[PDB]
Amino acid sequence: NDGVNAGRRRFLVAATSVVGAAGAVGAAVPFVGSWFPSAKAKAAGAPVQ
Amino acid sequence: QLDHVDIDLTDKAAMQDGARTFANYCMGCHSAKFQRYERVATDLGIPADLMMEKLVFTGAKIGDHMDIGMKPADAKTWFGAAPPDLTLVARVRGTDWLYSYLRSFYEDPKRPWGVNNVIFPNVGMPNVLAPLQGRQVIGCKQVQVVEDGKKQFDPLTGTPLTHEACDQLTVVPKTGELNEAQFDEKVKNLVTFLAYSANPNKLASERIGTYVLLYLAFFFVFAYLLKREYWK
Amino acid sequence: PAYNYKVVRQFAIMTVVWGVIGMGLGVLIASQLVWPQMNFDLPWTSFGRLRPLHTNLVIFAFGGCALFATSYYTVQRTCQVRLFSDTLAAFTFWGWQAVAVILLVSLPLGNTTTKEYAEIEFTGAIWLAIVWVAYAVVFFGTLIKRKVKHIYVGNWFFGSFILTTAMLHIVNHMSLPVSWFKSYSMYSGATDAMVQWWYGHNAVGFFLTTGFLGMMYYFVPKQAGRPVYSYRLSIVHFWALITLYIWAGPHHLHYTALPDWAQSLGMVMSLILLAPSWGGMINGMMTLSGAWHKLRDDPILRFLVVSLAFYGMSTFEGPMMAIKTVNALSHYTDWTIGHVHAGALGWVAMITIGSLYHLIPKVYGVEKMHSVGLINAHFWLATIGTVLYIASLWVNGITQGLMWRAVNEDGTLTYSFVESLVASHPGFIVRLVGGGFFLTGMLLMSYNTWRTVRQARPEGILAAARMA
Amino acid sequence: MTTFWSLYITALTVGTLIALLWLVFATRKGEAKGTTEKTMGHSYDGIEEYDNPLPKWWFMLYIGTIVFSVGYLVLYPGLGNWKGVLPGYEGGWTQDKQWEREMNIAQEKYGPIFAKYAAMPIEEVAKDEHAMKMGSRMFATYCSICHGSDAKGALGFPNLADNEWRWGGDPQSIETTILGGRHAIMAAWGDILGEDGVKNVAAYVRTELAGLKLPEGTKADVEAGKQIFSVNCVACHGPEGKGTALVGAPNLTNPGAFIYGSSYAQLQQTIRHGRQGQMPAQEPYLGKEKVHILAAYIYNLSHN
Amino acid sequence: GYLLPWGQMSYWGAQVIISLFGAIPVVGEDLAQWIRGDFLISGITLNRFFALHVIALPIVLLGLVVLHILALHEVGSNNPDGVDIKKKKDENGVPLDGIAFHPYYTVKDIVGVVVFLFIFCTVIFFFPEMGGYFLEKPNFEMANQFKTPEHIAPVWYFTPFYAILRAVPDKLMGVVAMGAAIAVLFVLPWLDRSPVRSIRYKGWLSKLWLVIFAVSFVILGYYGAQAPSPLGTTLSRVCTVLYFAFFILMPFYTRMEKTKPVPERVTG
Amino acid sequence: MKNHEILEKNVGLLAIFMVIAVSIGGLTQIVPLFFQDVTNTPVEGMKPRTALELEGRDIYIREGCVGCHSQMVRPFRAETERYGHYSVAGESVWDHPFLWGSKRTGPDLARVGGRYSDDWHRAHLYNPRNVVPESKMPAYPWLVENKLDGKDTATKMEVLRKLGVPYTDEDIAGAREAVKGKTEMDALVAFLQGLGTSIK
Amino acid sequence: AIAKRLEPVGKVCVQG
Ligand SMILES: COC1=C(OC)C(=O)C(C/C=C(\C)CC/C=C(\C)CC/C=C(\C)CC/C=C(\C)CC/C=C(\C)CC/C=C(\C)CC/C=C(/C)CC/C=C(\C)CC/C=C(\C)CCC=C(C)C)=C(C)C1=O
Ligand code: HEC
Ligand code: HEC
Ligand code: HEC
Ligand code: HEC
Ligand code: HEM
Numbered sequence A: 001n002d003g004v005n006a007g008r009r010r011f012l013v014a015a016t017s018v019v020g021a022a023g024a025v026g027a028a029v030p031f032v033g034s035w036f037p038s039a040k041a042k043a044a045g046a047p048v049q
Numbered sequence B: 001q002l003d004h005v006d007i008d009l010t011d012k013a014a015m016q017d018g019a020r021t022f023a024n025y026c027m028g029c030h031s032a033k034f035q036r037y038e039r040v041a042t043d044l045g046i047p048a049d050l051m052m053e054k055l056v057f058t059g060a061k062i063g064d065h066m067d068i069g070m071k072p073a074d075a076k077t078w079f080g081a082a083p084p085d086l087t088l089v090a091r092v093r094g095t096d097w098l099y100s101y102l103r104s105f106y107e108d109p110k111r112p113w114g115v116n117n118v119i120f121p122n123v124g125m126p127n128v129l130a131p132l133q134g135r136q137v138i139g140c141k142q143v144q145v146v147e148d149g150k151k152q153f154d155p156l157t158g159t160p161l162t163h164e165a166c167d168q169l170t171v172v173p174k175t176g177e178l179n180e181a182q183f184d185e186k187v188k189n190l191v192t193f194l195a196y197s198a199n200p201n202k203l204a205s206e207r208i209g210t211y212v213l214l215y216l217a218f219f220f221v222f223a224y225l226l227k228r229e230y231w232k
Numbered sequence C: 001p002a003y004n005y006k007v008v009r010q011f012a013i014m015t016v017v018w019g020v021i022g023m024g025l026g027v028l029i030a031s032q033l034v035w036p037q038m039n040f041d042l043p044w045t046s047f048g049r050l051r052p053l054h055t056n057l058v059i060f061a062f063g064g065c066a067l068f069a070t071s072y073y074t075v076q077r078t079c080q081v082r083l084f085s086d087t088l089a090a091f092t093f094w095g096w097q098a099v100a101v102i103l104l105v106s107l108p109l110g111n112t113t114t115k116e117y118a119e120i121e122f123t124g125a126i127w128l129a130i131v132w133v134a135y136a137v138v139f140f141g142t143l144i145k146r147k148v149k150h151i152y153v154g155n156w157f158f159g160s161f162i163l164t165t166a167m168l169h170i171v172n173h174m175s176l177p178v179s180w181f182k183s184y185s186m187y188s189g190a191t192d193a194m195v196q197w198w199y200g201h202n203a204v205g206f207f208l209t210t211g212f213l214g215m216m217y218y219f220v221p222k223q224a225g226r227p228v229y230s231y232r233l234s235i236v237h238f239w240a241l242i243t244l245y246i247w248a249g250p251h252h253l254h255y256t257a258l259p260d261w262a263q264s265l266g267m268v269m270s271l272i273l274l275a276p277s278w279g280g281m282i283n284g285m286m287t288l289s290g291a292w293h294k295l296r297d298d299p300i301l302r303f304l305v306v307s308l309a310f311y312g313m314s315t316f317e318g319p320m321m322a323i324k325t326v327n328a329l330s331h332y333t334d335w336t337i338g339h340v341h342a343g344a345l346g347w348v349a350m351i352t353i354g355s356l357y358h359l360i361p362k363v364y365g366v367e368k369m370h371s372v373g374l375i376n377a378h379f380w381l382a383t384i385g386t387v388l389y390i391a392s393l394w395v396n397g398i399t400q401g402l403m404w405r406a407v408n409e410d411g412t413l414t415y416s417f418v419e420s421l422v423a424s425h426p427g428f429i430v431r432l433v434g435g436g437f438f439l440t441g442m443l444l445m446s447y448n449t450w451r452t453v454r455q456a457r458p459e460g461i462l463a464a465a466r467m468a
Numbered sequence D: 001m002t003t004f005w006s007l008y009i010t011a012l013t014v015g016t017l018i019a020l021l022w023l024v025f026a027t028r029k030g031e032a033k034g035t036t037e038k039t040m041g042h043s044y045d046g047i048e049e050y051d052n053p054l055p056k057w058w059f060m061l062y063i064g065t066i067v068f069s070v071g072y073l074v075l076y077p078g079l080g081n082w083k084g085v086l087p088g089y090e091g092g093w094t095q096d097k098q099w100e101r102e103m104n105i106a107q108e109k110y111g112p113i114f115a116k117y118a119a120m121p122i123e124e125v126a127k128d129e130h131a132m133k134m135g136s137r138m139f140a141t142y143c144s145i146c147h148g149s150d151a152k153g154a155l156g157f158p159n160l161a162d163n164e165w166r167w168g169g170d171p172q173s174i175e176t177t178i179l180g181g182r183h184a185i186m187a188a189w190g191d192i193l194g195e196d197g198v199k200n201v202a203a204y205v206r207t208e209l210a211g212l213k214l215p216e217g218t219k220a221d222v223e224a225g226k227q228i229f230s231v232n233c234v235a236c237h238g239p240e241g242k243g244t245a246l247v248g249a250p251n252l253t254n255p256g257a258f259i260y261g262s263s264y265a266q267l268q269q270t271i272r273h274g275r276q277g278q279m280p281a282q283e284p285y286l287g288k289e290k291v292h293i294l295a296a297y298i299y300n301l302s303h304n
Numbered sequence E: 001g002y003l004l005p006w007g008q009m010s011y012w013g014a015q016v017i018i019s020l021f022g023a024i025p026v027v028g029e030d031l032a033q034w035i036r037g038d039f040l041i042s043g044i045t046l047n048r049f050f051a052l053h054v055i056a057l058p059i060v061l062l063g064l065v066v067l068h069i070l071a072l073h074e075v076g077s078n079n080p081d082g083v084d085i086k087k088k089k090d091e092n093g094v095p096l097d098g099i100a101f102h103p104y105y106t107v108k109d110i111v112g113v114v115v116f117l118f119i120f121c122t123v124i125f126f127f128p129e130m131g132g133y134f135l136e137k138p139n140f141e142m143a144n145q146f147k148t149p150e151h152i153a154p155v156w157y158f159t160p161f162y163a164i165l166r167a168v169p170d171k172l173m174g175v176v177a178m179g180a181a182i183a184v185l186f187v188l189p190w191l192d193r194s195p196v197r198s199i200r201y202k203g204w205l206s207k208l209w210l211v212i213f214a215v216s217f218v219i220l221g222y223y224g225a226q227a228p229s230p231l232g233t234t235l236s237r238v239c240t241v242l243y244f245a246f247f248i249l250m251p252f253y254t255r256m257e258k259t260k261p262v263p264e265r266v267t268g
Numbered sequence F: 001m002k003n004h005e006i007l008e009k010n011v012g013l014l015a016i017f018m019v020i021a022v023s024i025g026g027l028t029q030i031v032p033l034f035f036q037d038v039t040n041t042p043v044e045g046m047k048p049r050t051a052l053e054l055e056g057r058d059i060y061i062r063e064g065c066v067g068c069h070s071q072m073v074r075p076f077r078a079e080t081e082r083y084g085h086y087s088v089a090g091e092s093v094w095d096h097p098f099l100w101g102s103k104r105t106g107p108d109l110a111r112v113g114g115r116y117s118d119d120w121h122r123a124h125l126y127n128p129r130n131v132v133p134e135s136k137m138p139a140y141p142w143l144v145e146n147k148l149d150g151k152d153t154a155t156k157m158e159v160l161r162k163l164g165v166p167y168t169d170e171d172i173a174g175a176r177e178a179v180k181g182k183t184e185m186d187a188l189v190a191f192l193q194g195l196g197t198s199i200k
Numbered sequence G: 001a002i003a004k005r006l007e008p009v010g011k012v013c014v015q016g
C-alpha cells in the first residue's frame, strides 16, 4: 500500500453504504408488505338482516 | 409430439375469452380453487360487476375461490379419475402440452367415453369441446410432405405441399361450430388463461425483476469500485 | 511511477482478435455474394444480417479497439503521465468488449436500426455512449493532468475524434423504443437520410481518419525516428479537416430526394475537404524525408508509408465521387465499396497494422516481434489483396454503372439488371480472392502476436511501463 | 424555405468559407519562406516538429477549391434558397428540371421511333428486325423475371415461346394480355369436390387427357374422374379438356402448356387449393407504345 | 422442507426416502413407522417435518455454523496455494501473506454477495422454476396418495446420492452405499496423505482423481434426475465406483504421486 | 500566427473550439431540414402503411435488405425508365427509418409496388434462383414457416403515431387482428406491394 | 367489448 486515497475511500464507502441501505429497504418491502391485509382478509362482508 | 403455441399473457382479450371458455366448458368438472374471481377480474381487466354476471355461475362472491360443486371423490367415481384442479395445470404440464391435449381428442369406441387422446392416451376425460371442434377421428388426411426435415411449401401460393396419410387427426366436416383455425384460437385463449392462472405474478415479476437487476448492477458498480479501490 | 500499459495491451490483443473475426466475416459475406449457397438457408447467417455485423465490427471492434490502444498509449507517452483513472480505463476496455459482444449476439438475430453505421439498437446504443463518455473522461483528464506544457497534434486529433463520435452517436441514435433492441428513429425521410449520412460520413473521417490521423502523427515520426515535416501544416490540416468533415456529409445523398441545396453544399464542401486530407498525407509522407532507405529494412515503416499512400488515393477518389456528375455514374455501384475498402484496407487497416507491430513490442517488454519475416510477408499479403480488392471493385462498379445507365440508340435500355449481376460475378470472385489474401495476412499477424505475447516474462512487461 | 433559413444556410456556409480562408492565411502569415531543418523546439516523446512552411501547391489547391466553392455554389443552387445563374435552366440546375430536359430531348430523338412501329399492326412490326431487337431489350429488362430470360418461363409462369396460348394467341390477344393484364381464376375444388375427388379427377387429366401414366404404384378411378370432369370441370375448360381461351383456361391434354406442373403430386394442388395467376397490367409501368412492340416480340418468338 | 408444499413430488419423495428406513433388516419397518408417525406419509408426517424444518434443524444449523466458524478462526484459513502463511510473520506478528479480513475481504465478499444476488434475483423474478429443477413441475400438483408420478425423482441437489442408491441392485446395500457416500467425506481428512494441501502442488494422480470425482458427482446427479435407462444405469454404476474410489484410493495415490514444492510465499 | 499556442496550453479552450467547429457544419444541414415543407409535406394521396404493411417493413428491416436494395429512384432517364417515376421527399415523410439505401446488389425496389404479382414475390422470396437463375439474392425459406404473433403491432403503431405518423385509434385496435394468422412472407410481400404506390 | 367476449355459452329461451 502506497498513499491510500482518502476521501475517495470515504466517498466509495459512503456511496456503497447508501446504495446497500436502499437495497435493504427494497428487500424489506416484500416482508413488510406481506403483513398488510391479504386477499383472504379483504373478503369483506355483506349487510345482515 | 407436442404442438407449440405462442401464448401472450399481455393479451387481455385472449385471456378473457379463455376465462369464458374455462367458466363455461371446464368449471363443470374442474375447479380453479387456488384462484379467486376477484383477482382474475383484476388481472384480466374485467369489471367486477361484469365478472359477477358473466363468469361466476356458482353463486360465489367476487373474492371467493373458483370452487365448483363437483367433489373430487364423486368425480373420481364417475369418470374413473378425479378431474384435477386446473389452477396450476399450466405449470404442471406446460402450455404446449395443454394446447396439444385439448386438440388431440379423437373418437375411440373402445374407451369408456368414446374418445381417446394422442397426448394423454386412455385419458378419463370426456371430449367436452366436441361441439366446438366437431367430430375428430384417426383417419386419412393431407399432411405436408417432409423428407429428413425437408419441408415443402408451395413457392407461389406459400401453402404446404401435401400427401395423404392415414394415421392423422381429422375433423369430420360440418360437425362443429368452429373450423380448425377458430378452434385453434379458442384453445389458445383457454391455454393462455390457464397459463395466467398458474403464474398470475409473471408480468409483475418481470417488471420488479427488471428494476431489481438495474439496482443490483448499480450496487455492483459501487461495490466493485469500493473493492478494487481499498485493495491497492 | 509508470504508465497504465495494462489497458493498452488488452486493447491491442483484442484489436488483433476482433480484426481477424471481422475480416473473416467480411470474407464470408463476399463468398456469399459469389455463391448464394454459402447462406445455408439459415436465418442468422444470411448476407443481409451478417453484412451489418461485418461493417460494424471492422469499424467499431477492430478500428475502435485499435484507436483505444493507440490513444491510451500515445496520450500517456506524449503527456508523460499515467492515464487519468485506471478504473475507467479498464471499464472502457471491458465495456467496449461488451459492445462488440452485443453486436455479435444481436445483429445476426436481426435486431438492427438499418442505419448503416448505427445498426446497434436501443439499450445497445445507450451502453456504447456510457462507455464512450468514460473514454472521453479518461483521455481528456489525462490531457488535464499533463506533466508537459503543450498538447501534441495527435492528441488534438484524438480529442476531436472522441468528442465528435459522441455528438454524432447521441444525435443519430435519437429514437423511441418499442422494446429492448427494437427502436424507431425520430427523424423521417429526407431529414432522417440527412442525419443518417451526417453521422455516417463522420463514422469515417473522424472514427477512421481523424483518430487514425493521430495514430499516424505519433507512429510515423516515432517509427522513422524523424521530426514531423511541418507544424503549421499540422495546424491547418487539423482545423480545416475537422471544420469540413461535418459539412461534407450530404455527398452520400447526391441525387436522392434530399433538397438540392444540401447536395450542392455537400459536394462543394467535399471538394474543399480534399485539400486538408492531402495536407495530412503530405505531412505524413514528408516526415520520412531522409529516411526512405529504412523502408527496405523495417516492414513496419512500409506499413505506415503504404497506409499514407492509400490514404491519399482514397481522399482523392472520394472528392471525385462527391462530384454529382461522377456520383451519377457511381452511387449504388461497387465503386462505392471499392472506395470504402481503399480507405479501410489501404488506409485504416494498414496504419493499424503498422501501429500495432510497433506498439505490441513496447507494452509487453519484448524488444522485437517474434518474426520480422512474418511482418514482411503480412505486408506483401495485405498489399496484394488490397490492390486486388480495389481493382476488382473498381471494374465491377464501373461496369454496373455503365450497364444500368447504358441506353440503346432507340432509347430502350441496353442491359437488364441480371446482366449487370452476371457481369459483376468475376469482380466478386476477384474481391473474394483479395479478401482471402488480406485475411491470411491478418492470420499471420495473429500468429506473430501470439508468439510474441508468450515468452514475455512478468518483469519484462513491468519495466517497459516505467514512466519517464 | 423561409428567408430566415435562406439567410442561415447562406451565412453559416459563407462564414465557414471565410473562416477557412482566414485559417489558411493566418497560419501562413509568418512562414519562414525557405525550407528549414531547425526544429520547433518542443519535444513530446522525441517527436520534434520542423518549422517548414506551408507547401505552395497545397496552399494553391486550398484557395483554388475555395473559389470553385463560390463556383458551383453561385451557378447551381446551394446558398440558401438562392436559385442559380447557370445559363440554360430557368431556375438553376434542379434534379427535376435536368430530368425534364433529358426526357424532352429523348422524346424528340428516341420518341419518334416508338410511334412508327406503334402505327403498324402487331404482325407487321413483328417481321421488322429493328422492332424485334427493341423487343429483345425491353423484354429482357421489364419482362424476364417472370417469363424467363429466354421467354420460356418457370414454375407458374407461361412459356410464351411454346405455341400453346392459354389466354389466346391472336395478335390482339397478345396485346390485350400485355396491356390490360390478366387475372386468371381456378376455383379451389378442394372441399367443394371432396378431398378424394380432387385426387380422382386429378388422375383423369394426367391420365387420358394428358396422355401420361399415373405414377406407378398410385391409385385412382379414371371413370369417376371423368364423371367429375364432365360435370364441374368442363364449363370454363374444354369438353375434351382443351381449353376456353377467353377465361385463360389452358390445354389439359398437353403437359407442356401446364405452368403449374404435370405430375400427380402437383396436379392435385392445382385442383385442391386453386390457382389464380396474374399477368401484371403493363400499361402504367411501360405505357401504350413500348407495350405495343412487346406485343410483337412475342409474336415472333413463338408464332414466327 | 420439500415435503411441506405437499405436492406430488413432495409426498412421493418423502414416501420413498422414509421407506428407505424400511430397508434396515430388523428394526427397519418399526423405525420407518415411528419416523412417519403414521402407517403412511400423511398430515402427521407433514406437521412433524414442518416442526423439525422450521425450528429444530434451523437451531442445529445455526449452532453448527457457529462451531464451524469458531473452529476455522481457531486454526485459520487455508489458501489456494496451501501455503501456511503463519510461518512467515513481520516484526508486528502479522503474516507477510496475511491481510485483515475486515475491510479487504469484507468488501470482496460484498462484491461477491452483489454478484450472487444478481443471479439469485434473476432466477427469482424470471426463471423461478429453473426449467423445473428449482421448482419441480409435478410438485405443482397436489399430493395424491393413490396416484404416483410416472417417474419420481429427487430435487437436483440430492440426485447424485440417489443415483448411487439406484446403482446398487440390492436395497439394503443401496441404502448403505448412499449413506457411505456422505459418510466418507467425514473421514476425508484422514484419507488424504498428501504432503501438500493445494491441488496446484499435488501430483498428477491427485489432479486426475479430483477431475474424476467431480465428473462422477455431476454425472450421478444428471442420471439420478431421470428415469432409469441402460446407458444411464451403466454410467451411474461406473460413477458410483469412481466416486467411492476417489476416497478409498486417496490414501494410496496421495503417496504414490510426486508433489511440487509448496512456495514459501503465496503466489499472485 | 502564434496565438494558436493558447489553445495548446488549455484543454478547455481546445475542446470548446473543436466543439464549435464540428457543430457549425451539423447545425446548417440538419436543423433546417426541419421546418421545411418539401421534406415534411406528404404527397397527396398517401396514407400511413397498414399494420400488416408496417410488420412487413419491419421484417424487411430485420432481414437487412437495405444493404442490397435501394428505395430511391434518381431522376435519370435510364433510372426512371428502368424503375419508374423518380422518388420524391414527400414519399418518405412517414418512414422511420428511411430505407433509401446506398448499394444496388439488386434492382431498385422504390416502385415494385404493383409491378409484379404476389405469386412472384412468393416463389422469388422463397428461392430467388427458381425464377431468376442468375440471382445472387439469398433464399428466405423461413418467412413462410414462422407466423406473425402481433405482439408489438399496437405498441409499434402507437410509437409511430408519437413520431408524427397520422395513425388513428381504430388502426391501433385493429392491428392485432390484421396480423393475427398471417405468415411473415405475407407481411413482407404486402409491404413490398405498397412501395411507391403513391406516385405513378 | 368485454361483456360480449364473456357471454355465457348456455342460452335459455324464456316465456315473454
Ligand atoms: C425417489 O426417492 C428418492 C428420493 O426422493 C425423491 C431421494 O431424494 C433419495 C435420496 C435421498 C437423500 C440423499 C436425502 C437425504 C435426506 C435426509 C438425511 C433426511 C433424513 C430425515 C429424517 C428421516 C428424520 C429422521 C430423524 C431421526 C431418526 C432422529 C430422531 C430424533 C428425535 C426424535 C429426538 C428425541 C428427543 C429427545 C432425546 C428428547 C430430549 C431429551 C431430554 C432428556 C431433554 C432434557 C430434559 C431434562 C433436562 C429433564 C431431565 C433432567 C436431568 C437430566 C437431571 C439433571 C438436570 C440437568 C439439566 C443437569 C432417494 C434415495 C430416493 O430413492
Ligand atoms: C375445458 C373444456 C377443460 C380443460 C382445458 C380441461 N378439462 Fe378435464 N378432465 C376430466 C377428468 C375426469 C380428467 C382426469 C382424466 C385422467 O386423469 O385420466 C380430466 C383431466 C384433464 C387434464 C389432465 C391434467 C393432468 O395433469 O393430467 C387437463 C389438462 C384437463 N382435464 C383440462 C373431466 C372434465 C370434464 C367433466 C365432463 C370437463 C367439463 C372438463 N374436464 C373440462 C376441461
Ligand atoms: C413483358 C413485361 C411481358 C409480356 C410481353 C407478357 N408478360 Fe406475362 N404471364 C404471367 C402469368 C402469370 C401469365 C398467365 C396468367 C394466368 O392465366 O394465370 C402470363 C401470360 C402472358 C401471355 C399469354 C399467355 C398465353 O399462353 O396465352 C402473354 C402474351 C404475356 N404474358 C406477355 C406472368 C408474368 C409476369 C410476373 C409478374 C410478368 C412480369 C410478365 N408476365 C410480363 C410479361
Ligand atoms: C429482403 C429479404 C429482400 C427482399 C424482400 C427483396 N430482396 Fe433482393 N435482389 C438481389 C439481387 C441480386 C436481385 C436480382 C434480380 C432477382 O434476383 O430477381 C434482387 C431482386 C429482388 C426483387 C425484384 C426486383 C425487380 O425489379 O425485379 C425483389 C422484389 C427483391 N429482390 C426483394 C439482391 C438482394 C440482396 C443481396 C445479398 C439481399 C440482402 C436482398 N436482395 C434482399 C431482399
Ligand atoms: C373455370 C372456373 C375453371 C374450372 C371450373 C376448372 N378450371 Fe382448371 N383452369 C382454369 C384456369 C383459369 C386455369 C389457369 C389459371 C392460371 O393461373 O394460369 C386452369 C388451370 C388448370 C390446370 C393447369 C395448370 C397450369 O399450370 O396451367 C389444370 C391441370 C386444371 N386447371 C385442372 C382442373 C380440373 C381437373 C378441373 C375440374 C375438376 C378444373 N381445372 C376446373 C379454369 C377452370
Ligand atoms: C476527403 C475524403 C473522402 C471523401 C470526400 C469521400 C467521399 C465519399 C463519397 C462521394 C462516397 C459515395 C457514397 C455514395 O455514393 O453513396 C463515399 C462513400 C464512403 N466512403 Fe468515402 N470519401 C473520403 C474518404 C474516405 C475514407 C478515408 C474512408 C475510410 C477510411 C471512406 C469510406 C467510405 C464509406 C464508409 C462510405 C459509405 C459507403 C456507403 O455509402 O454505403 N471514405 N465517400
Ligand code: HEM
Pocket (backbone or CB within 6 Å): C023, C024, C026, C027, C029, C030, C033, C051, C054, C055, C058, C059, C062, C063, C116, C334, C336, C337, C340, C341, C344, C345, C348, C349, C431, C432, C434, C435, C436, C438, C439, F067, F102, F103, F105
Ligand atoms: C478481407 C477484408 C475485407 C473484406 C473481404 C470485406 C468485404 C466487404 C464486403 C463484401 C462488403 C459489402 C459489399 C457490397 O455490399 O457490395 C463490405 C462493406 C464494407 N466494409 Fe468491408 N471487407 C473487408 C475489410 C474491411 C475493413 C478492414 C473495413 C474497415 C476498417 C471495412 C469496412 C467496410 C464498410 C464501411 C463497408 C460498407 C460499404 C457500404 O455500405 O457501401 N471492410 N466489405
Ligand code: HEM
Pocket (backbone or CB within 6 Å): E065, E068, E069, E072, E076, E077, E078, E079
Ligand atoms: C452450509 C453453511 C456453511 C456456512 C455458512 C459456512 C461458512 C464458512 C465461512 C464463512 C468460511 C470462511 C470463508 C470461506 O472459506 O469461504 C468457511 C470455511 C470453510 N468451510 Fe464452510 N460453511 C458452511 C458449510 C460447509 C460445509 C458443508 C463444508 C464441508 C463439508 C465446509 C467446510 C469449510 C472449510 C474446510 C473451510 C475452511 C477452508 C479454508 O480455510 O480454505 N463448510 N465456512
Ligand SMILES: [Ca+2]
Pocket (backbone or CB within 6 Å): C114, C116, F066, F067, F100, F101, F102, F103
Ligand atoms: Ca444504407
Ligand SMILES: [Ca+2]
Pocket (backbone or CB within 6 Å): C116, F067, F101, F102, F103
Ligand atoms: Ca451501403
Ligand SMILES: [Cu+2]
Pocket (backbone or CB within 6 Å): C200, C201, C204, C248, C249, C251, C252
Ligand atoms: Cu463520405
